[PDB]
Design an enzyme around this catalytic site. Structure first.
Site, mmCIF file in Angstrom:
data_model
loop_
_atom_site.group_PDB
_atom_site.id
_atom_site.type_symbol
_atom_site.label_atom_id
_atom_site.label_comp_id
_atom_site.label_asym_id
_atom_site.label_seq_id
_atom_site.Cartn_x
_atom_site.Cartn_y
_atom_site.Cartn_z
ATOM 1 N N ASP A 380 0.833 -1.229 0.000
ATOM 2 C CA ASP A 380 0.000 0.000 0.000
ATOM 3 C C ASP A 380 0.866 1.278 0.000
ATOM 4 O O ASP A 380 1.772 1.406 0.811
ATOM 5 C CB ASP A 380 -0.901 -0.005 1.241
ATOM 6 C CG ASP A 380 -1.985 1.039 1.185
ATOM 7 O OD1 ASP A 380 -2.957 0.799 0.458
ATOM 8 O OD2 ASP A 380 -1.877 2.077 1.859
ATOM 9 N N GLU A 409 1.714 -0.123 -5.135
ATOM 10 C CA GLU A 409 0.561 0.720 -5.417
ATOM 11 C C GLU A 409 0.918 2.173 -5.280
ATOM 12 O O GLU A 409 0.447 2.818 -4.372
ATOM 13 C CB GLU A 409 -0.594 0.394 -4.458
ATOM 14 C CG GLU A 409 -1.880 1.138 -4.820
ATOM 15 C CD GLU A 409 -2.472 1.938 -3.674
ATOM 16 O OE1 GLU A 409 -1.891 1.924 -2.555
ATOM 17 O OE2 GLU A 409 -3.534 2.570 -3.907
#
Ligand SMILES: OC[C@H]1O[C@@H]2O[C@H]3[C@H](O)[C@@H](O)[C@@H](O[C@H]4[C@H](O)[C@@H](O)[C@@H](O[C@H]5[C@H](O)[C@@H](O)[C@@H](O[C@H]6[C@H](O)[C@@H](O)[C@@H](O[C@H]7[C@H](O)[C@@H](O)[C@@H](O[C@H]1[C@H](O)[C@H]2O)O[C@@H]7CO)O[C@@H]6CO)O[C@@H]5CO)O[C@@H]4CO)O[C@@H]3CO
Ligand SMILES: OC[C@H]1O[C@@H]2O[C@H]3[C@H](O)[C@@H](O)[C@@H](O[C@H]4[C@H](O)[C@@H](O)[C@@H](O[C@H]5[C@H](O)[C@@H](O)[C@@H](O[C@H]6[C@H](O)[C@@H](O)[C@@H](O[C@H]7[C@H](O)[C@@H](O)[C@@H](O[C@H]1[C@H](O)[C@H]2O)O[C@@H]7CO)O[C@@H]6CO)O[C@@H]5CO)O[C@@H]4CO)O[C@@H]3CO
Lengths: 649, 649
Positions: A380, A409
């Protein structure tokens, strides 16, 4: 000692960070090694690529060629085998035989110094023979030496004996190489197929519950795996599976204050029930997680866990490791932000007080999930944590477990996206969702399939929990169909987030890319059986797209991609190839109006002549066409998003 | 140890050969150092360039800036001082003060956590003060700390005390730099002004003879130096000054067989009278050469000798060092070729039998001419001798005598031309003579003034003994005028070969670039006094062009060059700048027809606004104009080749 060698060999590519980081490939993948090669004077040069495997063993004879005349830029295709750290070298050399042949072909019919010329050729071929290890091939060259030297035969006949195809063949495999000069070695990291190729599905286990127990468990969630395997996915990506904080917990639709039953946001990790090495008690136990992983594996699915290096204010770290957070003068920790977005439920980590403690704990967490069969981590927002930190953490994990794949990401500026890939991330998210017109798709995929492919592997999620693009919002189901086709055929890795099948496209408000009633903030039960029954799902198209991919190697690589012109702005056409497999895709980017277009194929780029006309099958429908230089297509939204055609023989 | 540092600083430029060879500059020359710099999170970064001199002493504080928003590409201008090997490093750092200021400007008028915000600023400024070495500047920051902390004052007033220009000034010179991270050092070779800037004249001493003695001597040739100094030249380039072979000597107009009085081609070096360390007996003695050098120096002229590493068949080397030549099977040495051209009078050197012997002898020869005041060598056809050989030879000479300048006469493919510069050649000949249209000149000078300028210094010879371009052949005197203007104003180094003044333009035959009755093969007496008297020379224009160059620093650098649009294909316009000096040139490339054009200046590129209108003087005529956004020009061939204008205040 001189920087340039006897025969210049310069600017070997690919290169990442001037050789300080490796270029990338996966098992079975081809790419081009190139170099600038030339010499002094007017005689010919040759070059070859020596690929060495992890034990330093050289690959096959791989001669290069000049890519365009007069550029001195040479290349050859190499193919990665076994996983590990390889190296490649370019060897450059004088090619005296090519030179001699050229001169001899002119001077012998002209009667100029013929005995001298032929004797010179004899001497090259004698030298050729010296470096040839096989007895039979050495005899073939020595018979050519003798023919060249037979003064009783016409000059033309003596020369022709050195130009026979069998002599060519020997010299093609064992050329006479003068003054061999090599480049310094460059590093190549070869990884497993799934690093480049794979279809991903994201869903929230907690949403797949029952009437008695609305909050799903790993056991209820496992019952969704077969529907996912049937659509032809390979990787299941789960949002954080850990306990979720209560302090500043968000309510439905990103409201500030959660009410008593609200489940909060998984990315707000940690409570007194545990942190990043624990399971949310509502999802069950570690043993239930092991059951889920087992059931995944049995259906051909790998699990990818979210790794979000951040904490809720109730995570144990907050009190046990305060120096892992930046504190303001009153002692508070400011919540995370990606402005204008605020994450009041989440505290970001500070890295500069105890970098070692953070690295140690991070790799321990990862290894724990690895011990439970998780070999893929979707990291993330990695761009808000230091680049060198990921470099260290990735080097440490892959040092013992090189099969582990990290997906970054990082939706941010190009420099950062590029650097994260370069320092170790196997895969990256991309700008795909914001590339919707023909010009945008064409320009962006030309970037990703070009030089960037030596360090980045793209994962084309057509949507995410945070990205419902305007194109889907306004285009409805025909837009979902188009975007599935594009994502599945343009990248060897693609993905969807659950509900994309159902064409969920209601935004939070006009101008937003958030979903209304986002799953991030609530249980989102979906009646899959009903959606299947009523035909209000595009699962069947998704299924067919993954099957097409599984049956056509051209769709499991990235680098070979060519865009063919059409005469309508709204109609895009492209082809991808791997060996004898050629896939040709035409898509109507307009989701509201039928478009007709003449697609004009670049035939030589398909390996064909201009006049040639070759049969194709649209794998979306089974229907067969004959296509060449110029083809009528008619695509009606709702009935025909695109043609996805394979070339047959 | 990680490849990327705490604050990423990547892809520092300029770079040559990935850092294995130095970028170039000369004393007083500016260029841009750039880097890709960014960090994790959303806070600001800063960067600066640390230039270290040959004793490792750091240069001045040189902060960089972002070159275009959102690109993360940063740059600053640096200026080379003393000659020698320097290095440069980019330092990247978090810039917490810039970040704090931005947030504080929003939050303080909004009433949000104001005491907390101001206290945070106080703490940054206290830290700032700690690294400030001067007592007075440290007091200025500490008074700002105290103001920020004065809770008895309105929040807006406490903040304004940290944003005063005197506080700005201190922080501009001594910013607070978090997490300073530097690049690895890159090398910079700084050389003397003449490496980049100089006007050159080539002539053959033997042609400047007398009635009694037609073959000139160094003593007769010295009498030509004043006419050359008066045209404003700095370097005199002489063809080989050594004995010339008799075996296969060429006759007039490149005929195969010389007759008894024919003088042969200087590049056919060597006879029993001596080789590359001797003087042609017809030119006189070494003492006469010393007289010539002295007379040159007194007029402001340096001598550049030709160095052609090749031999006539009568050069002593042929028998004394046979392994310096490639022999065919019958023992003969094939004469040199640059096909379809043949040099039957010349044998090329082979380098692979005795590379050490050749290097030793080559540097001995050069040092001999160096001991006699020759500090510049024009190296003949270096691309037919190995690249590493020049690398070695140049490193050896400049290792003891870094002031020596080598000019590479390599008219060949780009890779080789680029590599020769990169491995040590101070100067290179270029494609100039084959760039005659607006598009050709614009594209080519954009290449030479861009990235190539970090390794190549161009020498724009408008003609050579081997190149009489079709443009001059067909355009007559107005074409000679145009090409002088272009060469003199576009490169800081330019040159002509004698007779260019006289507009000599009769080719050997149509379609050739050889001169009829070439000086290479014969004495070429020219009646300079008559040509001066009759006005059939463009010496006066050449003189004025060199004066303009000597008076305008903008014409003595390469990198700053901008092309401004006109509305006629035949009319080109461009500007060059150095500090407050701006030179603006407009040239009619048509030598047969008067051209009128509207020149539309890019005003911001001149440092001006669009509406502004600023005075110029055409230095070719003394005439004054007022020019801005859009200007009428009228150029008549024969009377006005171009405007060469300086901006005044
Ligand atoms: O011989 C065939 C060739 O001849 C004719 O062109 C003239 C031309 O009109 C003149 O300008 C002059 O050329 C100069 C160039 O202006 C100057 O730049 C330099 O040229 C270099 C190039 O800049 C550089 O790219 C490289 O050339 C490569 C090139 O990239 C390749 O594409 C390939 O060139 C071939 C062409 O593709 C083909 O069209 C044809 O060209 C004719 C041309 O049309 C005709 O009018 O054949 C060529 C060559 O086989 O290969 C070359 C490598 O040679 O490097 C060159 C420098 O070599 O230098 C020249 C003169 O010094 O003169 C030419 C002919 O004299
Ligand atoms: O906020 C101001 C900005 O907002 C609006 O643009 C939309 C856009 O229509 C959507 O496509 C989407 O953008 C995507 C991009 O499609 C995707 O590429 C990626 O974008 C990255 C860029 O590719 C990359 O170059 C870099 O952006 C730099 C950029 O090079 C700079 O020039 C500079 O951008 C500024 C523009 O110059 C200026 O015109 C204006 O832009 C508007 C835009 O017109 C409007 O319609 O302001 C911007 C920014 O201040 O700086 C940027 C650095 O930010 O990196 C970006 C990724 O950040 O990602 C986005 C979405 O993730 O969404 C935007 C807005 O959401």
């Amino acid at each position: 000692p001189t920087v340039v060698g006897r025969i210049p060999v310069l600017d070997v590519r690919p290169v990442v960070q001037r050789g300080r980081r490796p270029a990338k490939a996966v098992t079975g993948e081809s790419f081009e090694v190139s170099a600038t090669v030339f010499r002094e004077g007017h005689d010919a040069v040759g070059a070859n690529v020596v690929l060495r495997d992890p034990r330093g063993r050289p690959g096959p004879w791989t001669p290069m060629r000049e890519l365009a005349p007069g550029t001195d830029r040479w290349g050859a295709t190499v193919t990665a085998g076994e996983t590990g750290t390889w190296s490649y070298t370019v060897e450059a050399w004088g090619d005296p035989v090519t030179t001699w042949r050229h001169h001899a072909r002119i001077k012998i019919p002209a009667g100029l110094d013929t005995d001298l010329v032929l004797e010179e050729g004899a001497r090259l071929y004698e030298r050729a023979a010296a470096d040839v290890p096989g007895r039979e091939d050495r005899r073939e060259l020595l018979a050519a030496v003798d023919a060249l030297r037979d003064e009783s035969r016409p000059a033309a006949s003596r020369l022709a004996a050195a130009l026979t195809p069998q002599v060519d063949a020997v010299l093609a495999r064992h050329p006479l190489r003068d003054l061999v000069t090599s480049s310094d070695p460059l590093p190549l990291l070869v990884e497993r197929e799934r690093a480049l190729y794979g279809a991903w599905y994201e869903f929230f286990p907690r949403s797949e519950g029952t009437p008695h127990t609305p909050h799903g468990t790993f056991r209820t969630a496992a019952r969704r795996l077969p529907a996912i395997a049937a659509m032809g996915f390979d990787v299941v990506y789960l949002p954080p599976i850990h306990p979720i904080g209560t302090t500043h917990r968000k309510g439905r639709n990103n409201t500030l204050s959660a009410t008593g039953d609200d489940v909060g946001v998984p990315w707000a990790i940690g409570s007194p029930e545990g942190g990043h090495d624990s399971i949310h008690p509502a999802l069950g136990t570690l043993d239930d997680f092991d059951h889920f992983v087992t059931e995944a594996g049995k259906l051909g699915l790998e699990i990818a866990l979210d790794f979000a290096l951040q904490c809720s204010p109730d995570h144990p770290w907050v009190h046990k490791h305060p120096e892992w957070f930046h504190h303001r003068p009153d002692g508070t920790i400011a919540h995370a932000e990606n402005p204008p977005k605020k994450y009041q439920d989440i505290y970001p980590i500070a890295f500069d007080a105890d970098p070692d403690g953070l690295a140690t704990e991070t790799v321990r967490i990862l290894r724990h999930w690895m011990d439970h069969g998780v070999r893929i981590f979707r990291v993330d927002n990695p761009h808000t944590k230091p680049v060198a930190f990921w470099e260290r953490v990735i080097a440490d994990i892959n040092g013992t477990d090189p099969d582990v794949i990290f997906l970054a990401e990082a939706f941010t500026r190009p420099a950062m996206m590029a650097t994260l890939a370069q320092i170790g991330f196997q895969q990256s998210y991309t700008y795909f969702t914001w590339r919707n017109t023909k010009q945008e798709l064409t320009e962006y995929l030309t970037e990703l399939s070009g030089e960037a492919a030596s360090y980045m592997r793209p994962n084309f999620f057509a949507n995410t929990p945070d990205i419902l693009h305007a194109y889907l919002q306004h285009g409805g189901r025909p837009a979902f169909e188009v975007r599935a086709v594009l994502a599945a055929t343009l990248s060897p890795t693609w993905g969807i987030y659950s509900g994309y099948e159902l064409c969920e496209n209601t935004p939070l408000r006009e101008g937003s890319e958030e979903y209304l009633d986002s799953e991030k903030y609530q249980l989102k039960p979906r009646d899959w059986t009903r959606a299947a029954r009523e035909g209000t799902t595009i699962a069947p198209l998704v299924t067919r797209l993954n099957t097409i991919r599984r049956e056509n190697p051209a769709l499991r690589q990235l680098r070979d991609l060519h865009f063919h012109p059409t005469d309508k702005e709204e109609v895009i056409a492209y082809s991808k190839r791997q060996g004898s497999n050629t896939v040709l895709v035409v898509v109507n980017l307009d989701p509201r109006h039928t478009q007709e277009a003449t697609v004009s194929l670049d035939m030589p780029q398909l390996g064909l002549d201009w006049h040639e006309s070759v049969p194709v099958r649209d794998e979306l429908t089974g229907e067969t066409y004959h296509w060449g230089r110029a083809n009528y297509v008619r695509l009606e939204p709702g009935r025909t998003p695109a043609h996805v055609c394979t070339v047959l023989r």
